[PDB]
Amino acid sequence: GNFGPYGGQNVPEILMGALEELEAAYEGIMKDESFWKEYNDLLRDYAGRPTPLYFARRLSEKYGARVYLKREDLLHTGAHKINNAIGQVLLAKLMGKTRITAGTGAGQHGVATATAAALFGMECVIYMGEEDTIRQKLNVERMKLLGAKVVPVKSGSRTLKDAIDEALRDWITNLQTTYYVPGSVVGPHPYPIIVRNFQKVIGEETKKQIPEKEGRLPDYIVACVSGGSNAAGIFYPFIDSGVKLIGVEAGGEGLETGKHAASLLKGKIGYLHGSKTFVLQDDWGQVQASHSVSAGLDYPGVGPEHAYWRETGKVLYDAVTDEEALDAFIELSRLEGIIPALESSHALAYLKKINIKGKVVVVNLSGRGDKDLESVLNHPYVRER
Amino acid sequence: KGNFGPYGGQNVPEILMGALEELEAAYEGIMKDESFWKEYNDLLRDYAGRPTPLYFARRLSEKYGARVYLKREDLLHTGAHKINNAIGQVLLAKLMGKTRITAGTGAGQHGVATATAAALFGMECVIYMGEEDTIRQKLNVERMKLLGAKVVPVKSGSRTLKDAIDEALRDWITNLQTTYYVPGSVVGPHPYPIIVRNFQKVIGEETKKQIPEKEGRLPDYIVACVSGGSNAAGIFYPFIDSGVKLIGVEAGGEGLETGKHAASLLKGKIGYLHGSKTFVLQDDWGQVQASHSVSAGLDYPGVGPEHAYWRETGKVLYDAVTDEEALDAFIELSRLEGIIPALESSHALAYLKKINIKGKVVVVNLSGRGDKDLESVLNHPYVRER
Ligand SMILES: C=C(/N=C/c1c(COP(=O)(O)O)cnc(C)c1O)C(=O)O
Numbered sequence: 001g002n003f004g005p006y007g008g009q010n011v012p013e014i015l016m017g018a019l020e021e022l023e024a025a026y027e028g029i030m031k032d033e034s035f036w037k038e039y040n041d042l043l044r045d046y047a048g049r050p051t052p053l054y055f056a057r058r059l060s061e062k063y064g065a066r067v068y069l070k071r072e073d074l075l076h077t078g079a080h081k082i083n084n085a086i087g088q089v090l091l092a093k094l095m096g097k098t099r100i101t102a103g104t105g106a107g108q109h110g111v112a113t114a115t116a117a118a119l120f121g122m123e124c125v126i127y128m129g130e131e132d133t134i135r136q137k138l139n140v141e142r143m144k145l146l147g148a149k150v151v152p153v154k155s156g157s158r159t160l161k162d163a164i165d166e167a168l169r170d171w172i173t174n175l176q177t178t179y180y181v182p183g184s185v186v187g188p189h190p191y192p193i194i195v196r197n198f199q200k201v202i203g204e205e206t207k208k209q210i211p212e213k214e215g216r217l218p219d220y221i222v223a224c225v226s227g228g229s230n231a232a233g234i235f236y237p238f239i240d241s242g243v244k245l246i247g248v249e250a251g252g253e254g255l256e257t258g259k260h261a262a263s264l265l266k267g268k269i270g271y272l273h274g275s276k277t278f279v280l281q282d283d284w285g286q287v288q289a290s291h292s293v294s295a296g297l298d299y300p301g302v303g304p305e306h307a308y309w310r311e312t313g314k315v316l317y318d319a320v321t322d323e324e325a326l327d328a329f330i331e332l333s334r335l336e337g338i339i340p341a342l343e344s345s346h347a348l349a350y351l352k353k354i355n356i357k358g359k360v361v362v363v364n365l366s367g368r369g370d371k372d373l374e375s376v377l378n379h380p381y382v383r384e385r
Numbered sequence: 386k387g388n389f390g391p392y393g394g395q396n397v398p399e400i401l402m403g404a405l406e407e408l409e410a411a412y413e414g415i416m417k418d419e420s421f422w423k424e425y426n427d428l429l430r431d432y433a434g435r436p437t438p439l440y441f442a443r444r445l446s447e448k449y450g451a452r453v454y455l456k457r458e459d460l461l462h463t464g465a466h467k468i469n470n471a472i473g474q475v476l477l478a479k480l481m482g483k484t485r486i487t488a489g490t491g492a493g494q495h496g497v498a499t500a501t502a503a504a505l506f507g508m509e510c511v512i513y514m515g516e517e518d519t520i521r522q523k524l525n526v527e528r529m530k531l532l533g534a535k536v537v538p539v540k541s542g543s544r545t546l547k548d549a550i551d552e553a554l555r556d557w558i559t560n561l562q563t564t565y566y567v568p569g570s571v572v573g574p575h576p577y578p579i580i581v582r583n584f585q586k587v588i589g590e591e592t593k594k595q596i597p598e599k600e601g602r603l604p605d606y607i608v609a610c611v612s613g614g615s616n617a618a619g620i621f622y623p624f625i626d627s628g629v630k631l632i633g634v635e636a637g638g639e640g641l642e643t644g645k646h647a648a649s650l651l652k653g654k655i656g657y658l659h660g661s662k663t664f665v666l667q668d669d670w671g672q673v674q675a676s677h678s679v680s681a682g683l684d685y686p687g688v689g690p691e692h693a694y695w696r697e698t699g700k701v702l703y704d705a706v707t708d709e710e711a712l713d714a715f716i717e718l719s720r721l722e723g724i725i726p727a728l729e730s731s732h733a734l735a736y737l738k739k740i741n742i743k744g745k746v747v748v749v750n751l752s753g754r755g756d757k758d759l760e761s762v763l764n765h766p767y768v769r770e771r
Pocket residue numbers: 078079080081103104105106107108109110160183184185224225226227228229230231295296297341343344366367368
C-alpha cells in the first residue's frame with residue numbers, strides 16, 4: 001500500500017485485524033465473477049453508467065477550445081461518490097457486516113452510502129460536521145429519507161475532518177458489526193486502492209469515448225482534488241499517456257491567506273486518517289483547519305496516490321479561489337444549462353488558466369450543484385453581482 | 386388531424402390561429418429533416434443522458450411477489466421526463482427564429498427543463514409558476530434563477546398550475562412575434578398534444594426494446610401517473626393495442642368523493658381547457674373548478690385529449706390513489722430501494738398495492754426524482770404523525 005514514500009497503514013493497533021480482513025476479502029472479490037456481475041449490473045441500471053461525454057458547445061465557443069464534460073452529475077444521487085459507495089457496501093454485505101459508518105462533507109458521500117445501505121438492507125450512521133449540515137442541508141434531508149442516522153459533529157472546525165474523526169471512533173467502537181466506508185482515496189491501506197479501483201471506471205469510459213469524438217487522446221483532463229477520488233478515477237487510466245493531467249485544489253480565500261484546503265501546494269508530509277501524505281500543518285506538526293467555499297473540498301489532507309503523482313510529475317496540480325469557483329458555477333449554469341457542484345466548479349474555473357485555444361479538454365463534472373444553491377445565492381460575492 | 390375521436394381540436398382565441406398554423410407547418414417540416422433529428426438525438430444522448438435504464442427493483446419485487454421494473458426517467462438531466470419535450474420544443478423554437486421562450490410550471494420540473502434548454506440555446510426565458518408552488522417546490526425556483534430564467538409568481542385563482550398556465554398563455558399572446566410557448570404536458574391546442582407525445586414516446590420505444598432483454602416477453606402491466614398525461618403517453622403510446630394492460634393513475638387527493646382531487650378522467654366533464662376539448666373538473670354550470678393534490682405536478686383540472694380518447698376506447702385503464710397512499714409509496718421506495726421518487730411518480734408506485742401482481746411482470750414509469758419534494762414531505766402532518 002505505498003505510493004513511493006506515501007500511503008501505508010498508520011493506525012492504532014486495534015485496527016490491524018480489521019484491515020487485514022478487509023485486504024483478504026478484497027483480494028477475494030478481485031477474482032470473483034459474481035461480485036463483478038452484480039456490481040456492474042447495479043452500475044448500469046441502478047446508478048446509470050456509462051455516463052456521457054458531453055460536448056459543451058457554448059463553453060467551447062467562449063474559450064475557442066473543444067471542451068467535453070464527463071457527466072458524473074448524471075449518476076444516481078448526483079455525484080461520482082455512488083461508484084465507490086455501492087462497491088464498498090456490497091463488499092461489507094458479503095463480509096457479513098451488518099452496519100455501515102462514514103463521515104461526509106458535501107453530503108454526497110453520506111447520501112451515496114445511505115442509498116447503498118438502503119439497497120442492501122444495512123444499518124447506516126453518517127457523521128457530518130455541524131457547519132456542513134447547514135450549508136448542505138438538502139443532503140441531510142435525503143439521508144433522513146433513505147433511513148440513515150445523521151450525527152452532527154460539533155468539535156473542531158465542524159467540517160469534514162472532524163466528521164471523519166468521529167466516524168473512525170465509531171468504527172473502532174463497533175468493529176464486530178461495522179464497516180467503515182471512506183468517501184475518498186485517503187485512509188490506511190487497502191482503502192486508497194479500493195476507492196481508486198471503483199472510480200477508475202470514469203477514466204476507462206472516457207478513454208473509450210474521446211476517440212469517438214476527436215479521433216485521438218485529449219490534450220488536457222482537468223478534475224478537482226480534495227481527497228482525490230474523482231480525479232484519481234479519471235486520471236488513473238491516462239497516467240504516462242502524454243495527456244496533460246491537471247488536478248485543481250481549493251485555493252479558498254487565496255493560497256497566501258492561510259484560508260484554503262490546498263494540501264499538495266501548501267501542506268507538509270505528515271499522517272492523517274491512516275495515510276502518510278501531504279497535510280496542512282503548522283511547524284510543530286499540528287494539523288490545521290482547512291477552508292473552502294465548497295464543503296466537499298474542505299479537508300486538510302490529500303490522497304497518497306496524488307502526493308506520489310505530484311512528486312513524479314505524472315499529474316500537475318494547481319488551485320483556484322472561492323471566487324473563481326463561484327464564477328464558474330454561475331457560468332456553466334447560464335451557458336450550458338448545467339448547475340455543477342461547487343467542487344467541480346474548481347475544475348471548470350481552471351479553463352481560464354490554461355492556453356486552450358484549439359485544444360481538446362475533458363473536465364470531470366463530478367457532481368451536480370442542487371445541494372449548493374442556497375449557499376451560492378446567499379454568498380456575498382454572488383450578492384455583489 | 387388534431388382530434389382524438391371527439392377530443393382535442395384548436396379551441397382558442399382567433400388571434401392564435403395564425404401562430405398555430407405556422408407551428409404546424411414548421412413541425413411538419415422538421416418531422417422529415419435528418420439534420421433536426423441528428424442534433425436532437427445527439428442532445429438526448431449526451432446532454433439529457435438517454436437511454437435511461439430499466440431497473441429491476443429486487444426488494445419491491447420480493448414485497449409484491451412480482452417482477453417490478455422501474456423505467457428510470459429520474460436519471461435524466463434535471464431529474465424528470467420533462468427534459469425530452471423541452472429540448473425538442475426549444476430546438477424547434479430556435480429553428481423557427483423565435484428569441485424568447487415562455488411556459489407555466491407546477492412541480493417546477495417543466496420550468497427547470499425549459500430554462501435549461503433555453504440556456505443551452507441562448508434564448509430569453511420567462512416561467513410562470515403559481516405562488517403556492519413557488520413555496521412547496523422552492524428548490525426548482527432556485528434552479529431556474531441560476532439557469533438565467535425569470536420566474537414570475539402567479540397570485541390569482543388557486544395559485545397553482547392552472548393559474549400559471551393561464552398567465553403564460555396571456556404572455557404568449559402578448560409576445561407572439563418573439564416568443565414560443567412551450568407546454569409541459571399533452572394538453573393544449575393542436576398541434577401541441579401530438580408534438581409533446583411524439584417527443585415523449587422515446588420512453589416507451591426504449592422500454593419496448595429493453596423489457597425483452599430482461600424477461601423475453603412484453604410485461605403484463607405498465608403503470609404511470611397521469612395529470613396532463615405526457616409521461617404516461619410517452620410510455621404507453623408504443624404499446625397501444627399490444628395486449629399489455631396499461632394503467633394511468635390520477636391524483637385522488639383527499640378522496641374521489643371529497644371534491645379535493647385532480648382526477649379529470651374519473652370525475653371531470655367534457656369541457657374546453659387551454660385549447661383542448663377534453664375532460665375538465667367543473668361544476669354543473671360549466672365553471673372550471675380548482676384541483677387539489679399533495680403533488681404540485683398533478684395538481685391540474687384537465688387531462689390530455691389523447692387520454693380521454695384512450696379511456697373512451699378502452700385502450701388504457703385509469704384509476705386514482707390518494708395523497709396518503711402517494712406519501713406512503715414515496716417513503717417506501719426511499720427506504721427499500723434507496724431511490725427517492727417524485728411525489729407525482731409515487732402515485733404510480735402506490736398503485737402496486739391496488740392490483741394483483743403475484744407472478745406478474747410490471748413496469749412503472751419512474752417519471753422524476755423527489756428531491757424537490759423533501760421539505761414538503763418531511764413537514765406534512767401525515768408524515769409527522771408517522
Ligand atoms: C467529501 C465529500 N464530497 C467530495 C466531492 C468531491 C471531492 O472529493 P474527491 O477529491 O474525493 O473527488 C468532488 N465532487 C463532488 C460532487 C463531491 O461531493 C462528501 O460528499 O462527503
